[PDB]
Amino acid sequence: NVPHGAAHIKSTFNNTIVSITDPQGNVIAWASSGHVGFKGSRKSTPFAAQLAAENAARKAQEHGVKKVDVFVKGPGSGRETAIRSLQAAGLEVGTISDVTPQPHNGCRPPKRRRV
């Protein structure tokens, strides 16, 4: 058991990983959109994370985590779908907050893709 814990939703442009955790940072279980079924583009969807974060919300229930702090990393679709399906499956939401890592002009990025 972890009686109180913490969730880390990284949502890239091409994927979402939902990983529920204790407060010390030692993960209990996890789910990605590719783990549910999908390949290629359908990992990146709004729906993708809705079905995955229910698979992340359970396995937390196997150990028995009934309240979980929320952490949004990444820009991407399904900010709401990860948040809402964690509520809809079980475990009501403790706190939500942005943790997208802004650099103070760190490294230089890759060159501009022109499609």
Partner RNA sequence: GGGAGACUGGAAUUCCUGGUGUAGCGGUGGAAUGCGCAGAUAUCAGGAGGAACACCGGUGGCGAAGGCGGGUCUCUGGGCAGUAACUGACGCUGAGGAGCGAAAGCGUGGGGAGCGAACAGGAUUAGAUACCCUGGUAGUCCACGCCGUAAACGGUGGGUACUAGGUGUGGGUUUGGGAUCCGUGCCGUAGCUAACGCAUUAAGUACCCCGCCUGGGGAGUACGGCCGCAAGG
Chain contacts with RNA (rule: CB under 7 A): 8, 10, 12-15, 17, 19, 21, 24-30, 32-35, 39-44, 71, 73, 101-111, 113-115
Contacts of 78 (CB under 8 A, 6+ apart): 11, 16, 45, 46, 47, 48, 49, 50
SS3 64: coil
**C-beta of 67: minimal distance to RNA in Å?**
17
**C-beta of 50: minimal distance to RNA in Å?**
15
| Contact between 8 and 71 (Cβ < 8 Å) | yes
- Give the rounded distance of the alpha carbon of 83 from its chain centre: 8
- Comparing CB distances to RNA, the nearer of 1 and 105 is 105
- Comparing CB distances to RNA, the nearer of 92 and 108 is 108
**C-beta of 63: minimal distance to RNA in Å?**
9
- Comparing CB distances to RNA, the nearer of 1 and 110 is 110
| Amino acid, res. 16 | T
